[model samples]
Target: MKIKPVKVESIENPKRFLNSRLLTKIEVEEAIEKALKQLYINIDYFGEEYPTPATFNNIYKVMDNTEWTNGFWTGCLWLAYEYNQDKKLKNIAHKNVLSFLNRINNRIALDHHDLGFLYTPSCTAEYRINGDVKALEATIKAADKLMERYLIINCLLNIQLLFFAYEQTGDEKYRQVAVNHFYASANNVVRDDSSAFHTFYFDPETGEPLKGVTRQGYSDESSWARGQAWGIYGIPLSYRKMKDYQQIILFKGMTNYFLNRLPEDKVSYWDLIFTDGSGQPRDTSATATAVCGIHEMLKYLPEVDPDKETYKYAMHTMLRSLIEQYSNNELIAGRPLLLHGVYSWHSGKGVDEGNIWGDYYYLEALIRFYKDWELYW
Candidate 1:
């Protein structure tokens, strides 16, 4: 995958949004403020519980678990702090991260492939923003635990954790782990067309490929939209931090696949292969998450990449579609922030409702759109 190097020039003046007619900076800022106020009020009303998922009837449920998504609420609050420089939100985010530290210290809570999701925003970002030594140490420990889950199966979700670890510690081992994950997945997780599988199982003892499964998508061979979203969002960001340019070619492939599949409004269905067509439930969470990555990748890509303008327009359209069609404005007074997220359609979990990750990425993308965004990974 040899490619010519393309140097990205520094921006003399950062653009807030591609088109102000679609969305104004003032509109995005007000939405951020309103989301903050609504979240705080909900926290006050709910007492000690953290916002997790909204019920089918739009009731927000609060719980404390090592669920992969537990960090998103704290991530959201941290983004709010970044945007507004609000000390109150900063304090709340600090406390939230502190509460999740037990999940890091205890071995029982560290069993999944989502340790990146659990620790990056809460621990690594905490260290980045506040220079918290304990947070850095905790993130390193979490990264070590996450390394145990990296079989030859090659989950892209775990790659970002190792990348963040390398960024924070300057440890070549972490960078090696990230590279290993990328190469292993470079052939297996990513298909020839740049679509992806949700999961691949490998024999732990012998390290032979066993099977590919789609736990969330409609079928084993189907392209789970969120899995594609994770690749689009995770791979390019990893490339930006990595030592090579070859991976950028891979990033471009996946980005083109994602952008080409998006509907006219720029949102994606839960699974690309699902034959329900317009009847399939949309996954705005995937849309939001991928755009955050797209926006971040723009910072590193050369100004002359042919797809640059196409990706920019796709990102703007995705954000606008999510804001106009998917948000639960009337219910944010009681429910979680963003809406119309598909959690797991196969097992009947969190379908067509507000999800914490959706809200986290939504705020993340909005912060980037405001030209005040900083990378946490």
Candidate 2:
């Protein structure tokens, strides 16, 4: 497929609003209160241990009750811990860590790719702040499980897990393994245009990209929207942890491409490659993910890149958009927050209604707006 060329415009300084004035203590408190009220809608059938979004049961039933993605629970734990240090949040998070621990087993290997989502936000963050060895050990064990997935064939997951291992153990093997895996994964999946796929299948010995395999991207030649979002967030994490400057540029490029494609409304589906004459389905999850990336990127402001105002504008515009349109206060989703979202087209449902992950990630976005040192990535 020949790539069509379009005239590129220089990214100007993001529109300067009086947004800094809005970042007062009072505003933060009000945002938290609004978030808490929204959290009330989620019902946890497993136990009312901590507050969750309204669609927890629905999501579980969809996944056959085998495993609850650690992301939602971790976000809930972070919110609960931040708001009040609730013991319920801790207990539930701990329980969830144990459940996802199964992902580490050699047979299951479900955790090959997402350690930060499964452990970092849930247990690792707490352990780091409070010196909880038991908690750290659990998270470390999860990392060990993640590292076990390392191989030339599964290098994408290997790189992601290897990073977690390095962060967890401070071991140099993990660092080297992570770097090797990063290059391998990038060479295979990352396109010349900076678009990345969620996974890249390869020949085990040769480490060569395979052909004719289905991927989670938009089209074989086009990029997936969520994968682009993940790249924007994940690359910055790599930059922060390893001090890799290339990762920083990679993040900026992907983020710029993503935002360039969207309308003023930040929402987007799995990919921008699919669009009507004007725009496509608004994916609240992608918007949430992009907002998370911006929040993470802002932490290294001015030092890494002096364009602080652009960061501020992206953050401000994103939050304002969410608050105005994608939320409700009356539905069962009222507590957890609700936005019309597309879960998956393949799933053939939830194409344009309230979704569990949407509520969870939106809460995460809100948390970033409301907390200091909020790492959405």
RMSD to native for every prediction? 5.3, 5.5
Question: Ten-residue segment with the worst summed lDDT in candidate 1?
Answer: 5-14
For candidate 1, lDDT tens digit of each residue in 15-75?
3223424568887777777667767776675554466654455566777755677777778
In lDDT terms, how accurate is model 1? 0.70
- The weakest ten consecutive residues by lDDT in model 2 span 1-10
C-alpha lDDT score of every prediction, in listed order: 0.70, 0.56
Highest TM-score model number: 1
Per residue, candidate 2 scores C-alpha lDDT tens digits across 274-370 of 6445445566666776777777777764564645566667666666676666665563432335465655544444455555556666666666676
Q: Give stretches of model 2 more than 4 Å off.
A: 1-9, 12-28, 38-65, 98-111, 151-161, 198-214, 274-279, 303-306, 331-336, 347-350, 353-357, 374-377
